[PDB]
From a paper:
MamA is a magnetosome-associated protein (MAP) involved in the biomineralisation process by coating the magnetosome membrane. Each TPR consists of a helix-turn-helix fold, in addition to a putative N-terminal repeat. As such, MamA adopts an overall superhelical structure enabling the protein to be highly involved in protein-protein interactions via two main binding sites, one at its concave surface and the other at its convex surface.
Here, we have solved a new structure for MamA from the alternative species, Desulfovibrio magneticus strain RS-1, and compare between other, previously solved MamA structures and this distantly related species of MTB. By comparing these volumes to a standard calibration curve we determined that the three peaks correspond to sizes of a 13-meric oligomer, an octamer and a monomer. Crystallisation trials of octameric and monomeric ArsTM resulted in the appearance of a single crystal form that diffracted to a resolution of 2.88 Å. ArsTM monomers assemble to form a trimeric ring, each enclosing a ~15 Å diameter inner void; the crystal asymmetric unit includes six ArsTM monomers arranged as two trimeric rings. The employed forces that allow the stabilisation of each trimeric ring include salt bridges as well as hydrophobic interactions between the N-terminal of a single monomer and the C-terminal of a nearby monomer in a continuous manner, resulting in a ring with surface properties akin to a Möbius strip. As such, ArsTM presents a distinctly atypical binding surface since, as mentioned, the protein-protein interactions involving MamA typically bind via the concave or convex surfaces. Unexpectedly, but not altogether unsurprisingly, the triple mutated residues (E140A, K141A and E143A), along the ‘backbone’ of the monomers, were found to be at the centre of a crystal contact. The tight packing of ArsTM within the crystal could not occur with the original residues, which contained long and charged side chains and hence, could not be crystallised. The overall structure of the ArsTM monomer contains 10 anti-parallel α-helices, folded as five TPR helix-turn-helix motifs, namely TPR1 (H1 and H2), TPR2 (H3 and H4), TPR3 (H5 and H6), TPR4 (H7 and H8) and TPR5 (H9 and H10), similar to previously determined MamA structures. In ArsTM we could not detect such domain movement, as the conformations of all six monomers are similar. Whilst these salt bridge-forming residues are conserved in ArsTM (Arg47 and Asp76), the salt bridge itself is not since the distance between these two residues is too great.
Author numbering:
A (entry chain E), B (entry chain A): 38 to 214
C (entry chain D): 38 to 213
Write the structure that this text describes.
Amino acid sequence: AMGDKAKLYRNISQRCLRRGSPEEALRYLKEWARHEKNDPEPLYQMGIALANLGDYQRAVTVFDKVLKLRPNHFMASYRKGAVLLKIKQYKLALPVLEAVVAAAPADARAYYLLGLAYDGDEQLEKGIEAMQKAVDLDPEEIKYHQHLGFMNVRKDDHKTAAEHFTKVMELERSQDS
Amino acid sequence: AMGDKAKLYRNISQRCLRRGSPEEALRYLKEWARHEKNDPEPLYQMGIALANLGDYQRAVTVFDKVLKLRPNHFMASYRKGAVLLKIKQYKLALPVLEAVVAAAPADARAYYLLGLAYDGDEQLEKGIEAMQKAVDLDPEEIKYHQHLGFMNVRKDDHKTAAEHFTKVMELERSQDS
Amino acid sequence: AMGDKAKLYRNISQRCLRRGSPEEALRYLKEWARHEKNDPEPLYQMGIALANLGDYQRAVTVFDKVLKLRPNHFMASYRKGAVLLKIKQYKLALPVLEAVVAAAPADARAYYLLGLAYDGDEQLEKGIEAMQKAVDLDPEEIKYHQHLGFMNVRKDDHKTAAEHFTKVMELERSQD
């Protein structure tokens, strides 16, 4: 069912993304899209490309095109959530991320993103609940203790912040190779 | 007779350009120019410097100074044409590039620049004619097959585009091995 | 007197600065400052951080906070001078730099900075006097001969400029 033109442009696209030049890959993803119109994958890959180039708003638009074709596209949502967050559109990220966590409830990174989102929207206790899940799902990861630390700082509870940070340090030390 | 100050500042200039710091070289090229006023070489090198810094509009200006002193300065034209094209001033780039091709008709890169200029000015068939010359003059070069491809895409002739791209791929493969 | 929270955030701060990520270190310097309020060192480190990030105007402000607590803080002034100069506020840099040179009169770099400052404020002869000090205090440094050269160029004395630059070249050659 996949045409020869699509196979070709998908191939060249992949090369460009592997040699790390998104801007070129885009031109060939457009072509793959042209020839398998209604296939979400090329659109999805555009989305990834546009996000790496920092053209965030247009990545959100492309991810929406992918979600129109597959409303439960797990990764499209994850990625869209991630960019909505990088752009500081927290209120719009929350429902998306909360959907991701519902599909992949053992995925620390997701709960971390969710926590950052809640924190941006000034729902601090919900950010802490999320980020704590991320810590519990992956306790080795410094990033998560660190944010829990700063989240406690903003709560004006400096006692707990320090507990989180003393652990940040214990971790940085034992990862000295 | 060149004169000792010129020899000196030329020397230092060269060092700076070789160690890859244009911004410093400029200061010395100015001086070489001060002392061999009417010699086009320093000006020419300024132009190259400015272009590498991305100060394009000022490079064009300096290349014009060089062409006022040597109206057939082959390289000054080539470089001016190249920057006119980077800045998207296509109409002005065409006569210049068309002059370079006339002086160096076996030079694929010139024809490629010319093709990109025509394509920017929405003269598509003329861009294909140029880019095809470039391909014919240097068939190993992926870049030229690739633009031919995309130029056919804009013509809405996807059959030929794919023929050019299948060759893009055959080339990318045999340059891994 | 230095307490456990400070020791901790100072520690983490240092790590961040060593692994070369200023933006993170800042967050922790803030915390060290919160807990040893009135200690100038965290503030001074903020200053350095901000200047590395290119947030120059806010570095000047923090260095000022450090100078309010220690008016002769030698390094605070040096760094503040250096950033005032990078930002092209020459008239304000001169008194600061002239203070640094008073405190560290064998420091070429300080005189070089001073000379650049004078030059920016169109006091060219004073710039040459400073830069010359820098060259005399550190004759191996190309940078200083170079600026002397260009300072003479602006004076329209091309004979001397060339003498400085022939030396710039002699030095670039013997250093490959």
